[PDB]
Point group: C3
Chain length 61, copies 3
């Protein structure tokens, strides 16, 4: 069970890397059209959930 | 083990919020270029997987 | 505990499908603006993390 929980945590960590890659990609597309001022709340929400996930990953370890 | 499974579920729940934020962001970029009629299947697939995840999160709880 | 670990793995598998749908969506938006040559590293990183996740999902099973 312990070994399996470590595997699941590893999957979650890798999916978080993928999530951040998609966020970065979306930001570049947004920047290509103009200033990103209108996405400041979207950015804040993303930053907040990322902080939450970081805390959970740290705690799981 | 129980406490750890709760933590993993919490991480998955937060990553789901992040996923929905990226979906919303992509939809706004799509809408900026024109009607989203061509993304109706993509929307259906996303809605379906989100339903699946919601069920699993509900079951895990 | 075993039943619960299976549920978490299922959630991770469904979220991976969602991640791939967002990646595909981003690629179409990128392609709409021109060639995707500048995203070859982004593609490589995404492909690599996806490979990692596939391995972890296979191992978890």
């Amino acid at each position: 069970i312990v070994q399996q929980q470590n595997n699941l945590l590893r999957a979650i960590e890798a999916q978080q890397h993928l999530l951040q890659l998609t966020v970065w990609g979306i930001k570049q597309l947004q920047a290509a059209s103009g200033g990103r001022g209108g996405w400041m709340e979207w950015d804040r929400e993303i930053n907040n959930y990322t902080s939450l996930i970081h805390s959970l990953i740290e705690e799981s370890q």
